[PDB]
From Swiss-Prot, chain C:
Family: In the N-terminal section; belongs to the terpene synthase family. In the C-terminal section; belongs to the FPP/GGPP synthase family.
Organism for this UniProt entry: Phomopsis amygdali (Fusicoccum amygdali)
Region span, Geranylgeranyl diphosphate synthase: 1-251
Sequence positions that bind isopentenyl diphosphate: K16, R19, H46, R63
Residues annotated for Mg(2+) 4 binding in this entry: D53, D57
Binding site for dimethylallyl diphosphate: R62, K140, T141, Q169, N176
Function, as annotated: Multifunctional diterpene synthase; part of the 2 gene clusters that mediate the biosynthesis of fusicoccins, diterpene glucosides that display phytohormone-like activity and function as potent activators of plasma membrane H(+)-ATPases in plants by modifying 14-3-3 proteins and cause the plant disease constriction canker.
Amino acids binding Mg(2+) 3: D53, D57
Subunit structure: Hexamer.
Protein name as annotated: Fusicoccadiene synthase
Amino acid sequence: AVLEAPYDYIASMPSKGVRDQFIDALNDWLRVPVGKIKDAVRVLHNSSLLLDDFQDNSPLRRGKPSTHNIFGSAQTVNTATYSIIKAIGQIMEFSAGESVQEVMNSIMILFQGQAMDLFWTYNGHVPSEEEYYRMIDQKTGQLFSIATSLLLNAALHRLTRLLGRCFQIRDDYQNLGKWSLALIHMIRSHMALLNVLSTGRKTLEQKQFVLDIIEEEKSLDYTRSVMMDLHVQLRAEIGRIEILLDSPNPAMRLLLE
Amino acid sequence: FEKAVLEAPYDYIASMPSKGVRDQFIDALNDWLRVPDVKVGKIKDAVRVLHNSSLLLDDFQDNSPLRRGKPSTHNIFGSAQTVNTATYSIIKAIGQIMEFSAGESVQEVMNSIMILFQGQAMDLFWTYNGHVPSEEEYYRMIDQKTGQLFSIATSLLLNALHRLTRLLGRCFQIRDDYQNLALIHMISHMALLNVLSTGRTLEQKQFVLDIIEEEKSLDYTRSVMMDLHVQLRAEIGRIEILLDSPNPAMRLLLELL
Amino acid sequence: AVLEAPYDYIASMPSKGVRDQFIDALNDWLRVPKVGKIKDAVRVLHNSSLLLDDFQDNSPLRRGKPSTHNIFGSAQTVNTATYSIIKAIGQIMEFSAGESVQEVMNSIMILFQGQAMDLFWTYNGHVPSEEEYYRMIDQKTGQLFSIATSLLLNACLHRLTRLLGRCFQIRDDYQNLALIHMSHMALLNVLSTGTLEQKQFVLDIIEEEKSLDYTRSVMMDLHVQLRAEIGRIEILLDSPNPAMRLLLELL
Amino acid sequence: AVLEAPYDYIASMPSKGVRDQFIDALNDWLRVPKVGKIKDAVRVLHNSSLLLDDFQDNSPLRRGKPSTHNIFGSAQTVNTATYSIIKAIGQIMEFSAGESVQEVMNSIMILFQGQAMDLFWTYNGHVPSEEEYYRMIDQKTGQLFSIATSLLLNALHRLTRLLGRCFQIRDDYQNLVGKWSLALIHMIHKQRSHMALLNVLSTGRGGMTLEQKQFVLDIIEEEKSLDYTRSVMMDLHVQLRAEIGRIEDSPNPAMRLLLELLR
């Protein structure tokens, strides 16, 4: 009731879910007899969204007030911690085989990635290409790993890795502070951008400068170029599994991608 | 650098000097139950991780910049980072219990942890909303928030006394108010509730301070702890004589006042 | 490259491009090659002065992208500005020999003197006269041109620089000497920091007096006198002057 | 008149000058008679650098008198600082004008490189290493001694560069009792309290609260990082006392007197 109220608010927010297709897509050729896996996964994602909205203050989520602006910062965090443990207990109910110790690490590594992101945006340590890809896989691609691992046992990991990275690159791609592939790769003029970010830490004219420097560097094309490389390799990954050729890959043909 | 970022706030709290009351209680109960030395160590540290994580959370929810030794963890690392490690440390604690401390009765450990959050949520809801406690559900509220940590320690030791762990937790939390129920035993009545609002001003505190010294509520509260200890003595004896040997380590611990 | 970063940022902006026309114009008469050293040595001095000048008046926007004062902080811009001037002195030493470089430094010594008076007037409440402002004009915008001509000459024309230099700063000021002209007593009292009404009032009192025509009057009379002077030197060396005779870009 | 106003204010303020005693103590070896132009030219350079750094670090009080930028403003202080350097160079030109004046300029050239690195680390959050801080100190403070000794030699440099390091560490040591100090780098690299201090410094840089300042004061004295300064300060003195001994080809009682004054 009172404890589960912050979680209940998020469930009413328009889901536009993307993981449920992925489990259904993996179920297509796995013939697993599904809901119990999805609902446990969904609680984890809802809690993860609930936490991150508080961590990075955003007045609105999708046109509606944020959970920490109407429920209080203290109450939202308590429900978020409670939600994860409820999901963990649910998973253990049907995961006697393949001891839940394996599912334990996937949750733990998930918090490892989110810790690295928060450290970088607090102490200002600029990331690199390899370092950023390590955090992006841990924070986002681990959720798909949990669903894939559960589905396989109750009856490919590289498929989740490639797909997991693409969604979080999407997150920074359509968004345009927090680091991004476009901003990281851009850093002709690099010293100018470094001092601008440090200045803004402690400014509308400067906000004009940063947006302009992306246009001249045209790093958005670079994100598009990397994104196409991901699709082709995963397309081979889809085709490499040829036991069932009837998979229509509808997630790949999503309109906005 | 991987684990250091994630565990930076936890070892900050683990380095604090603490009274170590929980270690005394688990050592006291071990003499009754004759628990092997190896399992006692794992139980003590698993409980210790949970307590430190709760301390990390409680500091952020209830803003307490002052803290023994060095300042609070949300003024030393940041609000975002301390919450992330608090959740991570809890999940590692559960996995630690599952790995060796518990074989096939892990469900009750999750159940005892789950109710622990429900009591904390109720307390936070009262503070934010402002609804006054009813002076009766506060005992049930304080049982869930503190007495469950004693219960989780007792339950693991038993599988490797029920009334004792519920009573001692109740007395322990009510002690902290005395050293710093008193605010709620008073509710003279209608004037206090009206003056409580609109400033939740200097004379209002003095009026509150004045009405303390006339009703002597803190003295009624003083008496609470005293009788609580005697209530605990009953259990010690009851078990001491039930147990082949009358382990009196708890009797020495009972001089907690 | 952090030291040179604020200077390079202000050099990425495509500048007005006037000294290059002037140094190329003068080289038409004096067949001296070396000019590239003169071109960039003066360029370093002007950009470094621009870095300093922008900081002192707290200009929040030079052209388009924000100024160096708002990007690298006040500390780094000043350090880079001071470092670039001494480097500019160094480049002159390598080619321009001794004494020549000493006289060269006397101009830069003088050039900072004129800038000091302007800041003193802006900071301490003071009123200038026409004579005082005219001297301040020469010491700031005319010393840079004098350096450029002096280096070219040794590798008269001095009167040309002070006439052309005086025009360029008053021409840029015209994009707003008008306030130097000035009833006068009423305007002086509000000039001492007294509020939008007084900003309106001063606008009418200068528009109704047609000080813009007065500023244009100094523009025209100074230019026509110079046009005789430039021809005077162009016949001394018997030159048609196909390039310097282009003074209509600054009109 | 008004151009010399801020420099004269900082030149009339008397302070314990050690760069002055370096020249005449060194002159006891070289016996070069002109030290009058050498001593004052270095003084103008040092005073000019002082005006810049005061505005650069926003120092409220130099030693009790109001800061030069708090009475004349930031605009005039920078203008008079740049002009003073040019005059200081002009004084140096009057002697040895035939050549070797490029030696003076590259000494001034490298001086600004060190201050830029110090500013860049302060404005951003680039934590320095032990090697990085040592080379920056040499090229920021120890270079002013190197230019002074070079002109005297024209009319040993190992002594001057290493004397610069000892002098600046004392100032950094005296500074503590948000820039960088040798205590900060030494404890950052060590395992204990590495992450805690790194987050605290980023937290203040918006400023550090009273409790947080106490924490930073608490950690330094408990890890003997303040004791680490005397570890490298005293050792440095011993090896320097050998360097002066080996060059001397006449007895020099003067330079030893300077060493005991330092510590």
